[PDB]
Symmetry: C5
Subunit: 385 residues, 5 copies
């Protein structure tokens, strides 16, 4: 007689699979698991969901499947079709769709009754991701493995191995994607939503962090030269007039860019992602950059003005010192046509002087406002890094 | 004899699962349920659909599965494969796709015949969402649980617990997403589409509200500085000419933004979402802001005009008081070249005076139109909040 | 003996489900159906497909499942697992994917052999939608229910109820979405693609119409103020020069908008959706609005021109009446420098006169072209409505 | 005895369905098929895939299912559950996903053993589409029906009917979508990837063509008025200066449009779709249209130039003929201020003359370049049509 | 007796399929496979996933299915339903979703026990794609075929054929899509994540390369004329003023284009795709092209300046040589009005001279900077090609 199927006929002859198998019904049949996290596929923050590919193991002690290695030629391990035996009802509490994993048809058994189960599982799972510190984030995500039906009286869930070995386990991992995990933290919990019920749950605080080294040259790099185009915008002379239309073109251009960052960030109602304030401060800087630009051209244009008062003109002098035959009546009619016409040009030349001194000093105080603001952010770089 | 499977063989030997099980066929086998709402996954308003993750319970009294705790060593609870017994045919009337939930293989039984069923269920469900008060909305959504086939003669549906306990149940809930529910309202209904038929239905008026604290800084924040760019637009001098091209650039810029809000809002045929009118009033404000801008430059430009009539000029003076040898003929030819040429400059200077007084007064009445309009909206904030 | 399963064992003992059940094989077992249309989920016109949620009924006379209410305690209705009996092979000919409906496990039977089947069914179905009269359309869509295999010899398909009751049936319906149906028209058809074959088909001319009350304030409302910005565009003085750049900014702005309406409309090869011509006439109106703008500035600019000929100048006068010591040679050198220089300004002033009279008359004939065009469209409103 | 199921019990008592059924194993059981193409659902060229709804037929001679019409009351046709008999393993070699078709549960049998199978099938299939002649294309797509496992020794595949009847078969077809087929070409092939193996394959060169009557008014109609805005762009006077900003606005506007056509066209690496060159020639026409615009304003502006040399000025005259008391020293100081100042205006007037003659002649040679180019394309219309 | 099913009844009478079949349990039942890669469907780099259609083969020696060709009329090959026998548990370690392949119901057997299995399989698989050399890339992608459960004690995996024949196998392949493979490299590996376990894995280094002949005329062709519009931008005269607004329009236009290339490229955290630096160098070239444009107009404008100092003016002369009755007091008042007014025009004319010499020399050094930069890239073409 060929011996291997001789075991299976002897084993599975009366194994009624519709029983949580035990010798004594008071005893909880303890399942015992781990995870080995393989990769992080995608984090679509706008959908508040997370897809993860996880290698996975189980065993549990089965009373009924015990044999002896005698009379079957020293066989201690054996392969069994999964749907021909019992299985625990465990699944994760935070799934969105479980239809992506193939069903492993086969499991092992030992002669003590330790039936061993491996399977892969992918789950698009939903854990509350944090988006506050955006390019430097840690995602305290949670996978809570749970018997959906059975209680502590029926089964308990525990770990395969030492939780320290779960913690720093990077034995197989696809890095160089977007993400990278620092550890996986297991923890038992005893769950009871109500009275007279009690459920085994054992969470997995999987924490991952993002490599910012792509997002810096895709989001911080657009923001920096948007400064220097306006910085070189002040080097335009004020009297040209398109210097106003210069800024608004960039105010149009920055308006385009803030729409692009709008949908890329999720709709998370814990508040603004913190880089968005550092982002949104830039337009108000541009508005006051624009508010400077309108001010001098309201100040300086040929508008038939009044004269500059000397207290501000000495203040302009201080700021310059701080920043650095009755034929006569026809002939009199000629100068009378020009004694004001040349002078109204020079009254316009007087207010013209006021433009350039403000052009110098507001350029520095705009530049020193930005440059002192910039050094604050790179201190936040080394704190985030 | 091991005792647990001794029960299952004694129980399921003749349980023909193709029977709605009862001792007497007049008796309606009453199922009895609840919901425990876990999370709200997504509300895509444009698709008029809603995805919801719901923990769920059932029991019903089964006549045939009764045993005694005697002769089976005091066992009162026991696990059974679901497809080996009867099940009620209930499902929700408003689904779009039920393929996302895993099938729980196992159910409990008691020695009285109370077979107990738990399962999770996600349904992309379609209820008529309201979009009228957009950032402050309540969504009276409905889940109507229904035996698809059986009538009141066959089964009745009732609640597990007190409906008060269903009402304020936030025992497990993923908040800090977008949504948050205030209560879940159950209600029995007796349904009959026709005569000679009657179906048990028990609705669930699930109501949720949106946290506006993200949408305010993503939709109200763009709208406010679009005012102040035009507010500072009047501080441009009128004679520049790009002041017209200034506004149209923003009229172009606001035209961009209204397309962005178009697809974000659904196609709901109950009317405009009410914030859209408050949104669409802004362009007509900008048009009359533009209509001011064209008016003064039609009024003020060097066009070889007629003189200003004094009744409007005294009205301009009132508004200023309200807002605050035959060689002679060659020489006569010289002044004749200039007695009009200097004067036509000054006739242009006369209409130039009319521009700035209108520049002052229309600036206030534009500003006071906007500022009085703005205080109306913040009163609507505290009513919505 | 408990009596209900006593029937089922007596009934299903020898019911070989692999038989289209009849006593005599010449007799066609007539199935008999209806529809009760619940809701219209989505009409994505670009995909030429339609998703519809339909409640659905069947019966057919089964020879083999007859019993007597005697000897089974007056039981005339009974629930049966669907996969334990015969079923007809009907499905709809125009599906794209049938995987969204759950399988109802249960059906009724009567003591005459009328087995009754209810089930829901959703189908993304493909019927040739019409997009010609876009915001006011009726969609003569068709659902042709068909035995996929069996012929008229095997089965016939008929209606449950009177076709009048199918016609005006709005007993359950989710309105206030986008769509609304006026009626559902059933009709039998006898189908034969070839000789020696004949198939029962019974169509359903489901017709729905769209509530335009959202699309009017999302597509007609952008089109109307695009007129009045150019209408107020003529109130710009011609000599400014940005009046040309004014229009092209809107010609740029209208170019943006026609791309937005491009993908929103499907690729239907029956021709242009009829509102698109009314849409596309606007740019050619803007081009000739632009062609006016270039014409006057080609006419009016300081270009050292020739003089205006009086026949057009009297025509300009008619249109104005229709719209309303040898020291002398140094002194002679002075006027010779200015007798032309002042005159070439006035020759430019002469052509300047030609601009404003054309500015008046072309403004009216532009306005009267648009306003008379507009009253044509509102007559088409009351015909469409 | 009821006779119909009397056959089925007599027939299917020992029909072991795990046998490719034949009396003699050398004989290849020839299956025999056709297609009846119903509709073309979508051609997403960017995904290089094609979805098609096909009605489909089979028969094959089964040895084992033969009966006599005697002793069963002259029954020659009969319905059988598909999963209770053999089936051939055929499928198409170019699928992407087969999960969209429902499983027809039923098949016919005849008393000779001709079991007949009908089923529908939709396949998103991948055939190498051609995109070269874009709005006028023919798509030589291929469906190669293949026994996936069995060889020529086991089965052969042939056609049901005459291949001529397959060729012009438009008996049922949903036209008025986008596409329309001219014919379906079947052809047997004998396939062997290697030695000692041989597989029956029978292709289907399905060829379809596109109705261009939508794409012409969605892609050719934008291209034509983009010419005439620049054509009317030359009617702007050169000295205005925004005439340069005119063209670049359209150069910006055409830059927008070429991005819109970029993603609409696939990434097919056989080269550019041929209309794209006719599309991309337009920008280089606009660049040289712009290069004209910069040239004259570089030529004509008040820049204190040198004089025009008469050889080009007589060439400008040829092109015009081709296109059509010591008080004196104060008085001498007056003319010395103006003998050059009036002249430098006239030196600027001399180069001003050069602008308008080039404005005339370059306008024609731009127009005649475009108009002669346009008549080349309409000849390509009648060749494509 | 019909002989073919006589074998199947004799064969499958006691084949308990729940056994990894062998005579002696120490022997590892070696499976033996290959791949025949058919096509590459899509490479969505942003999702870091890859879909591939692969024809596939297996055999393994089965102990139990041996027969003799005697007593069954010389039958050496035979078709068997797959779910009626054993199967190995192999699958690929890098899948995302296996639900797209149909289940082939049938397999072959030989009289030695070589059961032969063919099936197709599509997998959206995840391998770490490289995006560095973007239009000229090679993708060292990996398919690691693995028994998910069984160890080296249970099964070993080997190749069907010689690995050289796998290497250059292009026997069937859909080219002319986007991709093309140069070879497929198989390699055995012996895998053990831990101690006391050992798994057969046999990788497939599938390497493919991209045909750049579409992406060159879709991404390199936009970049080249963006140079020459600014190259012709310097031919604008500086004094016009819109020459500044010229460049910023293209700086706006290039800002549009870099957003388009942003999402087309993935989020790969190995760094920037190398063409992006060659792309992003263009804006900084445009900024310094803009920085030239602001410089000369800051240098040249009528601003009532100081005089040019002769050391720079002789340097400007060097660069030009490198690039090429008391009536008198009324009359004195006349010249005093003009002795400066004409001179301040000429002081403005002096700085005007400085503009054009810088216009010549900066034009060359801008052009020679670009042209010498361009020849570096075409050397990188022939290295990449
Ligand atoms: C398999 O079927 C094909 C038909 O598709 C057979 O080809 C025919 O063979 C006969 C005689 O062998 C010829 O008269 C026909 O002209 C052939 N038709 C075509 C389309 O080739 C082929 O012989 C069959 N092979 C086997 C082994 O049965
Ligand atoms: C498992 O299969 C591999 C083949 O992939 C075996 O490796 C071969 O082993 C033989 C002798 O052991 C050598 O001659 C070959 O050169 C090896 N080939 C390769 C590619 O390594 C391996 O021995 C097998 N192991 C078991 C336990 O059967
Ligand atoms: N060769 C993969 C088998 C395997 C080895 N170690 C594992 C750990 C977890 C798991 O799911 C599977 C495995
Ligand atoms: N541990 C989860 C079991 C569970 C406890 N309480 C529940 C309530 C509803 C439900 O579907 C399931 C449950
Ligand atoms: N309670 C829903 C049962 C039901 C009542 N009337 C119906 C009509 C059609 C249908 O599919 C189902 C029904
Ligand atoms: N009434 C549809 C049955 C039918 C008739 N002719 C057909 C041809 C092909 C097919 O798959 C099916 C059919
Ligand atoms: N006619 C396709 C059968 C076939 C022939 N050679 C093959 C190689 C691999 C495979 O999966 C299948 C095949």
């Amino acid at each position: 007689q060929p011996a291997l199927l001789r075991l299976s006929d002897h084993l599975l002859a009366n194994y009624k699979k519709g029983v949580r198998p035990v010798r004594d019904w008071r005893k909880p049949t303890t399942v015992s698991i781990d995870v080995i996290m393989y990769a992080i596929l995608n984090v679509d923050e706008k959908n508040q969901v997370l897809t993860t590919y996880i290698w996975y193991r189980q065993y549990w002690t089965d009373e009924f499947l015990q044999w002896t290695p005698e009379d079957f030629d020293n066989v201690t391990k054996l392969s069994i079709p999964t749907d021909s035996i019992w299985v625990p009802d465990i699944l994760i509490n935070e799934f969105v769709d479980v239809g992506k994993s193939p069903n492993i048809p086969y499991v092992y058994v030992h002669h003590r009754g330790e039936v061993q189960n491996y399977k892969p599982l992918q789950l698009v799972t939903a854990c509350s991701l944090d988006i506050y510190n955006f390019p430097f984030d840690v995602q305290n995500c949670s996978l809570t493995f749970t018997s959906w039906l059975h209680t502590i009286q029926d089964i308990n869930i525990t770990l395969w191995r030492s939780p320290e070995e779960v913690r720093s386990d990077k034995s197989i991992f696809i890095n160089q994607g977007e993400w990278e995990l620092l550890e996986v933290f297991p923890q038992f919990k005893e769950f009871s939503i109500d009275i007279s019920n009690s459920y085994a749950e054992m969470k997995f605080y999987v924490i991952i962090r993002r490599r910012p080294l792509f997002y810096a040259v895709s989001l911080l790099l657009p923001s920096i030269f948007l400064m220097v185009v306006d910085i070189v915008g002040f080097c335009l002379p004020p009297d040209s007039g398109e210097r106003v239309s210069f800024k608004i073109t960039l105010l149009l251009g920055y308006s385009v860019f803030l729409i692009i960052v709008s949908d890329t960030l999720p709709a998370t109602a814990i508040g603004t992602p913190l880089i968005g304030v550092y982002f949104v401060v830039c337009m108000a800087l541009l508005v006051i950059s624009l508010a400077e630009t309108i001010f001098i051209v309201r100040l300086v244009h040929k508008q038939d003005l009044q004269r500059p008062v000397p207290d501000w003109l000495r203040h302009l002098v201080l700021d310059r010192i701080a920043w650095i035959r009755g034929l006569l009546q026809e002939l009199s009619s000629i100068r009378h046509f020009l004694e004001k016409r040349d002078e109204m040009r020079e009254v316009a030349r007087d207010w013209l002087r006021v433009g350039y001194v403000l052009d110098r000093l507001l350029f520095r105080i705009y530049l020193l406002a930005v440059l002192a603001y910039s050094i604050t952010l790179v201190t936040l770089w080394s704190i985030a890094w």
